[PDB]
Design a protein around this nucleic acid. Structure first.
Lengths: 126, 140, 194, 163, 118, 106
RNA sequence: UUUGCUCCACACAAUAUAGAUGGAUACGAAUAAGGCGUCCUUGUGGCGUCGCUGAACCAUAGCAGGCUAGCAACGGUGCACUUGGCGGAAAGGCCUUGGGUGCUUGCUGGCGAAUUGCAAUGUCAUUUUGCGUGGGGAUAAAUCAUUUGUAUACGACUUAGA
RNA sequence: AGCGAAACCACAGCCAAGGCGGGAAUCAGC
RNA sequence: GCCCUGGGCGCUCAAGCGUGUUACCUAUACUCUACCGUCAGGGUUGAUAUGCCCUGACGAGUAGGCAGG
RNA sequence: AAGCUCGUUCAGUUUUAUGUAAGAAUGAAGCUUUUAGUGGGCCAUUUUUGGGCAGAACUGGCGAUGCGGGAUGCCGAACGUAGAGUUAAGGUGCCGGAAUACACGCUCAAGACAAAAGGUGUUAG
RNA sequence: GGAAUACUGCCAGCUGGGACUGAGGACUGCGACGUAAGUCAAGGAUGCUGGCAAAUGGUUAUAUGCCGCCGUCUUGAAA
């Protein structure tokens, strides 16, 4: 069960920082918290919980850590590598690439899909 | 009639249209087929080739607004398209020249098409939409 | 979009579900409602029961008010007031609607759908009272609830065996895909998004 | 979205000074003129606004337990009220107080007077439990019954509210 | 040619209010809720419906219809053949109709209603 | 290919109107998949075609088609206003429509 | 009623669509948790992990989709049969054994595409009905009349008879 | 089984309430 | 602050209440343009006329008055 | 409407004089004479009368008034016939054309004259 | 100590997508380009192309989306 806490890494859902990762530095109240993400370039600002979704990853961060301290802790924890290995980041990247596919790329994808399907069907029953 | 001041400024083509680009026709007998752009004609039409030997689409004049542009491009520098002109389509059953010229044009492009893998079969397949397709999102 | 959409009334709200179904019908979309006996309405049982009993006695005098007992017919009446009935456009829209208690065939062998914004659990605040509708129908005169449950119990059976067979088939397909991984075609597909 | 401005006046002297929160300088000037009559006997034509300048937060990057003294004109007279609000800036803290007053007492910009706002740098100084609970050591709590805005009209997975 | 789109503005001919319900009431327009131009009621003819001067009285063929009943009248249009077309009155016998048509064809004047009683 | 579709499908809702006044000169057309006016901006200027069948054989075929055009977006749900040289009959409320991909610019 | 009635095969027309233009693409239960794969000292159990949308899954390449050649398997699949099971809620559908017969774009080639002239939905779905043949199936019922008397204001109702 | 009118006739009517207004045809009660 | 005693369907973290922030719906209202008319100004004949024109404004309405068919 | 003749003279327009010499601002005439019709009350307001009610001195609005909104009877806006775009009032769950939009709390029965009083009803100083 | 950025206002800055409008009728006028001929988005649209012996469209019936008995009367517009 994901819980909001200092150092918790989160994904922004909407806004200019949408799709970027941030970390909770200090909780302001029940509905608003302070987040930061120097690596992603998102400026230090407060945000409401409704506009952000909590990720399952977590790292230790000093309470009220400044931008430099937040960046240093983020780099030390290497949470970015863990995020990429997560199935959620993989799905996001897959969706982005699929949406970026060209028509000729889509035709090649269809050809490869048919080739794979032939072998997969041949592998069954046997 | 007063001297209307409206000069015949030359047409300006969108940057997405470049010679050798793969075109898609949305209207006509060849609607849904993939074609290769060659040259822009004085009549504001686009000179294109199937090529004929690959998908059966001959050299035809088409309008840009009915053509969807694609990023895939092929070499078209070796094809001498200067022979074709607006007068080449006047009529005032296939003409003899229409076959030899088409074959000559396709000879200098079939090799280029075969250079890129799966490009020949890609052109041989007619483009069509599918359930759930969102053309605005798709880059084409 | 599917030619016909089947909506599962389980855990849903009568008001929002009826509103969305009517809006879709006006747009020219065919919709069918199943498991209507399990639909839910906001508020406690007493409030909903009184709101319905008072309706039965408000008079037009039998030409107007009808003491209709079927919960599916109650839902249709709820949706009836959200459509421009007594007109060709509204009446034609209602022609694309059907409501059945439980899931009778051939809808059983077809994929049902749910409305995310009409879920009773999703929109109703946790801890607040709610009405199951089935009890209201039983109390107001409905008597087929027992038979409905009895013949719906068989629906869960057989369907469970079909799900088990599909689970085995998907297990085999997943194994085939796993052993199929690392292939050149699979690697190319992964590189090209897919 | 309020804004903090410093407005002074002297009826064309003592140079009366106060802080005014308004969405724009025009509203700030009107509020300053209105407060002048309450503070003393002055009229708009008496003089002119010597200077008006917007005040920006020294550092809108720190959480501050703002202590605010606010007087409002209820339906039966005006009463002095004091509250503590946890926020990051004075502009947001005063807006939150205004929204809370409008939600409960139904007091709005027309009948709300801002007296003083000051930060609290020591624990146990805030006497309000609703703010005191957040002053403890790094804590954790869940967000049960989360929901997602389903753009599609139809859903096939029966979405769950888990977080 | 000088035959631009002739907008009739209001093609539907006006009818007397309530004339359909009562037989005795003729369809000829006559003034009296209609006087108050209430919503959903027949519109009242007014100055807004005036046709453009440059296209007033012009038939769809872009020529004015001029009644003719003698050779002299038809010849009078020799100067204005470009704009005025000939029209034979209903009282003209078929005997003179042939002569009128022949003269109009020889002078290039179009006949709005040819083949009359022929 | 089994599918030969080259036009984006949609639905016809109702003409531009108020609470009690409706102007049939403007038709509100809903396009499948569109959700916001920003997405609908791409469909502006695209020809809209309605296809219906009649028992009588018209001069060219048994099919009759109306040729319209797109004008501007409508609402926050992505609805787009459509104008036709001849307004569609009111009986087609809720019926489907064909939105072609031309004239295009991509 | 010149198979008159009926169900079928092919076969030409009218009739229109409340409105295809790839696929309604099947568990249950909770929403302060459920699945998936595994373990089993089988449980409200342990382990790895999935959600945060279908923005997907199945399919989709060929004159609107033809002819033909070669390679690898006998897999995929359009269709006529056949053994058997399930589906009574509106079951009227789900399939299952075995071959037969086309395609197979899983892979590699040879053929025609044009003239609709720069586009005119460029005509491919069935709902109902009408007329022309052949492959079978069965050949009845009701009203009046006659009358009844349980019925009976008059209708009506209830009867017996080749 | 006769012989053939008069009165009347803008047009209405099945009721829930306020702006004083939710179906073939004939036979039996007022 | 709200509750209890004191338009239809339905709505309940409202689709109720107060307030703050954006977008959208459309009157004969407003802004650009096509046309009729009235009102005002001006060009007009070493002939181009109660005519051929250019520019602007205006267009509700009973009795009543005037003008044109 | 009817002659003159001044092109300037005027104003339901706004502050200092003490109501104005205003070379303060803003906008843009006069005497006549005879010629049809014209004898209502009212919505709100004003002066603010007393004990329910009844007259009343006044200022905006109809009579002759369309149109959008309020299911229908005050707000907006006052009207040639048309094409195009933005709005007022009023709305954006369906009927009903428009966001089941965002943010702060409230409420269990409401919600689109009774407030004199009570509640171990709920949330704040 | 240093920039950056949010916000405000300007661009006689650039570059597109979409909707309606083509109104005037041989040149006289104000402007830009050019060393000059001449050109121009500069006191109102031109150039090219395709389908056609019923073409476009009109009256009418019927069904769909919305709207909705008369003259005189008191005169408060009224039943």
């Amino acid at each position: 069960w994901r819980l909001v806490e200092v150092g918790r890494v989160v994904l922004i859902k909407k806004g200019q920082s949408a799709g970027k990762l941030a970390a909770i530095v200090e909780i302001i109240d029940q509905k608003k918290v302070l987040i930061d993400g120097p690596k992603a370039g998102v400026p230090r600002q407060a945000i409401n919980l409704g506009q952000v979704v909590l990720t399952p990853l977590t790292f230790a961060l000093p309470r009220g850590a400044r931008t430099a301290t937040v960046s240093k802790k983020w780099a030390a924890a290497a949470v970015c590598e863990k995020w990429a290995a997560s199935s959620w980041a993989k799905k996001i990247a897959q969706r982005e690439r699929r949406a970026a596919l060209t028509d000729f790329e889509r035709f090649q994808v269809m050809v490869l899909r048919k080739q794979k399907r032939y072998t997969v069907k041949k592998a069954l029953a046997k | 009639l007063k001297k209307t001041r409206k000069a015949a400024r030359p047409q300006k083509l969108r940057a997405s249209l470049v010679p050798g680009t793969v075109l898609i026709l949305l209207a006509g007998r060849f609607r849904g087929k993939r074609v290769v752009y060659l040259k822009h004609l004085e009549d504001n039409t686009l000179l294109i080739s199937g090529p004929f030997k690959v998908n059966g689409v001959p050299l035809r004049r088409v309008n840009a607004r009915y053509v969807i542009a694609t990023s895939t491009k092929v070499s078209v520098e070796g094809v001498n398209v200067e022979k074709f002109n607006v007068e080449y389509f006047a009529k005032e059953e296939i003409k003899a020249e229409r076959v030899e010229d088409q074959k000559v044009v396709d000879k200098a492009l079939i090799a280029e098409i075969k250079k890129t893998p799966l490009l020949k079969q890609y052109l041989s397949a007619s483009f069509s939409l599918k359930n759930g397709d969102k053309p605005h999102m798709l880059k084409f | 979009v599917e030619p016909v959409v089947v909506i599962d009334g389980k855990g849903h709200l009568v008001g929002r579900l009826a509103s969305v179904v009517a809006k879709q019908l006006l747009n020219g979309q065919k919709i069918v409602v199943v498991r209507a006996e399990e639909l839910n309405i906001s508020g406690e049982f007493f409030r909903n029961k009184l709101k319905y009993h008072d309706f039965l006695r408000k008079a037009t005098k039998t030409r107007g008010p009808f003491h209709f007992r079927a919960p599916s017919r109650i839902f249709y009446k709820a949706l009836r007031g959200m459509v421009s009935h007594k007109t060709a456009r509204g009446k034609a829209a209602l022609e694309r609607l059907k409501v059945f208690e439980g899931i009778p065939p051939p809808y059983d062998k077809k994929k049902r759908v749910v409305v995310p914004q009409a879920l009773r659990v999703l929109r109703l605040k946790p801890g607040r009272k709610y009405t199951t509708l089935g009890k209201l129908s039983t109390s107001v005169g409905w008597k087929y609830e027992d038979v409905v449950a009895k013949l719906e119990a068989k629906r869960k059976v057989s369907s469970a065996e079909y799900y088990a067979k599909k689970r085995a088939f998907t297990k085999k397909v997943a194994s085939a895909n796993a052993t199929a991984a690392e292939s050149d075609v699979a690697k190319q597909l992964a590189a090209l998004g897919y | 979205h309020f804004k903090e401005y410093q407005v002074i006046g002297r009826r064309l002297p003592k140079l009366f000074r106060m802080r005014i929160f308004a969405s724009n300088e025009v509203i700030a000037k009107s509020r300053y003129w209105y407060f002048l009559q309450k503070l003393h006997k002055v009229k708009k034509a008496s003089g002119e606004i010597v200077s008006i300048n917007q005040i920006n937060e020294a550092h809108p990057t720190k959480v501050k337990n703002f202590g605010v003294w606010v007087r409002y004109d209820s339906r039966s007279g005006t009463h002095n009220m004091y509250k503590e609000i946890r926020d990051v800036s004075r502009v947001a803290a005063v807006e939150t107080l205004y929204q809370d007053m409008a939600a409960r007492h139904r007091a709005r910009f027309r009948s709300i007077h801002i007296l003083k706002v000051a930060e609290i740098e020591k624990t146990a100084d805030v006497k309000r439990q609703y703010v005191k609970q957040f002053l403890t050591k790094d804590l954790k709590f869940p967000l049960p019954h989360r929901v997602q805005k389903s753009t599609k009209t139809f859903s096939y997975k029966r979405p769950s509210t888990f977080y | 040619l000088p035959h631009p789109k002739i907008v009739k503005k209001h093609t539907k001919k006006f009818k007397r209010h309530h004339s359909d319900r009562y037989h005795r009431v003729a369809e000829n327009w006559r003034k009296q809720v209609v006087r108050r131009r209430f919503r959903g009621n027949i519109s009242q003819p007014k100055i807004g419906y005036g046709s453009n001067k440059k296209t007033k009285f012009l038939s769809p063929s872009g020529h004015k219809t001029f009644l003719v009943a003698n050779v002299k009248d038809l010849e009078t249009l020799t100067m204005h053949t470009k704009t005025y077309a000939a029209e034979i009155a209903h009282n003209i016998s078929a005997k003179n109709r042939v002569v009128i048509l022949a003269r109009a064809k020889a002078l290039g004047i179009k006949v709005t209603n040819p083949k009359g009683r022929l | 290919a089994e599918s030969h579709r080259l036009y984006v499908k949609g639905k016809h809702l109702s003409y531009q109107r108020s609470k009690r006044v409706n102007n049939p000169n403007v038709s509100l057309i809903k396009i499948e998949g569109v959700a916001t006016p920003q997405d609908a901006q791409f469909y502006l200027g695209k020809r809209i075609a309605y296809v219906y069948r009649a028992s009588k054989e018209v001069r060219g075929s048994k099919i009759r088609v109306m040729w319209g055009k797109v004008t501007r977006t409508h609402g926050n749900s992505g609805v787009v206003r459509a104008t036709f040289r001849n307004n569609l009959p009111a009986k087609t409320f809720g019926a489907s429509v064909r939105i072609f991909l031309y004239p295009s610019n991509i």
